[PDB]
Amino acid sequence: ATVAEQGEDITSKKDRGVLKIVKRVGNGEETPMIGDKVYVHYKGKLSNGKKFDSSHDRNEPFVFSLGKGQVIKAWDIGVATMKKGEICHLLCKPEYAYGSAGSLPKIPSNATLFFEIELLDFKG
């Protein structure tokens, strides 16, 4: 409800597909470029508030190459806006996440996802 009402629309289409609230400021003024390796911790919740995934259960950072579609669209878009050490909240419409297919059983069809994401590091 906070992110839905106060979050910044960081999509190009301005369709409110990805809404962002910074929770902890990062340290660099720098954000990752496309193709940079990004290292994140994250927690994801559905709209009933139920968890669906977290990097913290293994306590192992989630690692991906930014802007290569190795992750949901909301992450390629959101993580690009983050500074090293930043934590943000992202509210993600299904079009920018798992869509009508979902990711069953954990993620229903047409689910809006809520992520808390920490950008631990990134390297070009």
Q: What CATH number did the domain enclosing 22 receive?
A: 3.10.50.40
Given the residues 72, 77, 107, 117, the one annotated as active site: 72
What does the H/E/C string look like for 64-112? Answer: EECCCCCCCHHHHHHHCCCCCCCEEEEEECHHHCCCCCCECCCECCCCC
Question: What single letter denotes the amino acid at residue 9?
Answer: D
Question: Residue 64 CA to chain centroid, in angstroms?
Answer: 12
Instruction: Give me the resolution in angstroms, 1 decimal.
Output: 1.7
Q: Is 77 in the active site?
A: no
Cβ distance 63 to 75 under 8 Å? no
Cα–Cα distance for residue pair 11/116, rounded to 1 Å: 18
On the 0-12 / 13-18 / 19+ scale of CB atoms within 10 A, 15 is exposed
What is the bridge-based pairing of β-strands 51-54 and 113-123? Answer: unpaired
Query: Would residue 87 show up in a list of annotated catalytic residues for this protein?
Result: no
Q: Annotated catalytic, 122?
A: no
The catalytic position among 10, 36, 52, 96 is 52
Q: Is 1 helix (H, G, I), strand (E, B) or coil?
A: coil
Note if 96 is an active site residue.
Answer: no
Phi, psi of 91 (to 5 degrees): -105, 125
What CA–CA distance (Å, rounded) separates 92 from 123? 25
Q: Which of 10, 87, 98, 117 is catalytic?
A: 98
- First-to-last C-alpha distance (Å) of the chain: 35
Which domain, by its residues, includes 111?
1-124
Q: What's the Cα-to-Cα distance from 30 to each of 4, 25, 27, 48, 119, rounded to whole Å?
A: 26, 12, 8, 35, 12
Confirm whether 72 is a catalytic residue.
Answer: yes
Total domains in the chain come to 1
- Is 42 designated active site? yes
Task: Identify how the structure was determined.
Answer: X-ray
